Design a protein around this ligand. Structure first.
Ligand SMILES: C[N+](C)(C)[C@@H](Cc1c[nH]c(=S)[nH]1)C(=O)O
Length: 272
């Protein structure tokens, strides 16, 4: 009786924890394997390096993050989600022999956000509009967003924006923008905090941000050993809407429910 245990990790926050718990539930129900979820395991580069080193077995990675952060050189991608997925999938298999399974439906993009009041007061609708006020407002951005070419380096290069940026921890940036310590932050578009704190996402008028859909990323060797993982995890391929994920994020991060329970009830009610 081979009862291999898979280590399923997530980036920071309730959403990767929810996803990792969905993977665990699906794997334990439909395979002979068990899984352990590692919440808040780290940021993108750490999940990626841990995956390549074998320290974790699966994590949810996002299509535009594969092409921008993980592929070297980074290919030039369009705004069509399925083509970006194919670029990410083919590229990461060739580069790192990682198998990137089929993406979920929802997009979770970086989103430059300001309080509604600020957008109204300063006449902000687009990211380009921030040039109007870059000497007046303060931004608080995660370090990873600051480090990424599709993040603050891209605000600089694509938009010529020179924001006054405080580097922030992921879990502290929304309280900072809600309290007025900052007026700009790098939201994730499925974060529950956008609605909870009456924040407005500025339109990405120059299309800095690629599409970002999540999907399981694992070593090709793991899929070869356990080919059933493809069918089992692709249960979620093309499922989960933006509104659905944002509500799950609300349940875990705002209402404090366990990610396992929230994941289980969603799968029971909406997928299986
Ligand atoms: C979903 N997302 C917005 C495209 C980001 C979110 C993220 C980046 N780093 C951490 S931690 N989370 C990503 O996963 O690359």
């Amino acid at each position: 009786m081979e009862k291999e245990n898979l280590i399923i990790a997530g980036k920071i926050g309730p959403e990767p924890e929810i996803l990792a718990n969905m993977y665990k539930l699906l794997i334990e129900e439909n395979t002979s394997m068990t899984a352990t979820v590692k919440p808040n395991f780290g940021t993108t580069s750490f999940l990626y390096e841990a995956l390549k080193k074998g320290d974790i077995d699966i994590y949810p990675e996002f299509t535009g993050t594969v092409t921008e952060s993980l592929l070297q050189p980074s290919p030039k991608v369009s705004h069509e989600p399925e083509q970006v997925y194919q670029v990410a999938r083919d590229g990461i298999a060739k580069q790192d022999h990682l198998a990137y399974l089929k993406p979920m439906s929802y997009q979770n993009t970086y989103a430059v956000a300001v309080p509604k009041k600020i957008a109204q007061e300063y006449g902000l609708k687009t990211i380009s509009d921030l040039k109007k006020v870059e000497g007046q407002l303060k931004a608080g951005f995660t370090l990873e967003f600051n480090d990424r070419e599709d993040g603050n380096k891209g605000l600089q290069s694509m938009y010529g924006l020179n924001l006054n940026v405080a580097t922030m921890q992921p879990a502290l940036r929304y309280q900072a923008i809600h309290s007025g310590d900052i007026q700009i932050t790098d939201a994730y578009s499925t974060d529950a905090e956008l609605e909870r704190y009456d924040l407005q996402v500025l339109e990405d008028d120059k299309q800095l941000f690629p599409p970002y859909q999540g999907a399981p990323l694992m070593k090709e060797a793991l899929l070869k050993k356990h080919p059933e993982l493809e069918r089992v995890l692709n249960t979620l391929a093309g499922k989960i809407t933006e509104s659905q994920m944002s509500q799950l994020n609300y349940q875990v991060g705002v209402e404090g429910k366990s990610a396992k329970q929230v994941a289980k009830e969603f799968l029971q009610e909406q997928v299986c």
